[PDB]
């Protein structure tokens, strides 16, 4: 059930706040987002397909 | 070691040269031998000869520490075949009054990552050879690249078997560069001043190895490098059959 506490209002800090979050753990694991922001550095240039080309070794 | 889109291998009869380093076949003049009749003959041709079209591979020299920038050696053709290292290609010759004929052929040379150096490999129409159309015997830079001139001729400008090896490369040619390659391989089609040769008296194609870049390497790296090459008559068409030409030499 609940404990004890019987005000009317609404909390005043929000539930994130006022308690712990309860988290539930799958068995299988879980994937993290593939990114955690928009931070990077970025490599450029990394293959190919266009140049002064096929004058270059085979 | 050796790559890829660089390994090759050409066959010719009952001969197959195989290369793991080359960078392509120069076909001089863009054109290949036909193998058409002469125009200038009633006579039928005896050509397709099986026999005949494939590759005879001898060793030209031996190239050193020694050699200067330009001296050269000349392989006349189809002459240096026309021996007993010819096979049925010189038999046949030997019996026919004229070839029309074109060429095809691999220099081969080896080295290492540890040596420096470079050859100028190529094919040239008219090219002046020995009186007696042979295959030079060493390494000479004899008479470049004014020509040769008779002895009291003191004051000639020059002689027309003249030879500016400064524009070598205006000859279908590729370069043997040891940090890049092991074999060369041209190809030239048939050219003279009429449709068949009578090549008993006219060497008319000359294959030429020159040194352009000095050979190079420190101590324990091999120090002498075999020069060797493999020719192949390309759709030879004779004509003029009568007896042995003999002296074959």
Known sequence: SEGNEGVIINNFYSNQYQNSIDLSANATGSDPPKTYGQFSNLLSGAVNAFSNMLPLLA | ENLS????????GNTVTNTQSTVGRLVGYGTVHDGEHPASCADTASEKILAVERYYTFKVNDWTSTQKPFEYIRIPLPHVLSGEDGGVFGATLRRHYLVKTGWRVQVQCNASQFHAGSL???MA?????LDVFAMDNRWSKDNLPNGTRTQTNR???FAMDHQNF??????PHQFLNLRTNTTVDLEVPYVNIAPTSSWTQHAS???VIAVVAPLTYSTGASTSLDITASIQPVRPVFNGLRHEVLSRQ
Not at chain 2, 5 to 12: E, F, I, M, N, W
Not at chain 2, 125 to 129: F, M, N, V
Not at chain 2, 166 to 171: E, S
């Open chain 2, 155 to 157: 004051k000639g400008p």
């Open chain 2, 120 to 122: 100028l490999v190529f």
């Open chain 2, 5 to 12: 889109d660089r390994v090759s291998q050409d066959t010719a």
């Open chain 2, 166 to 171: 400064w524009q070598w490369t205006l000859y």
């Open chain 2, 205 to 207: 194609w000359t294959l």
């Open chain 2, 125 to 129: 129409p008219e090219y002046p050879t």
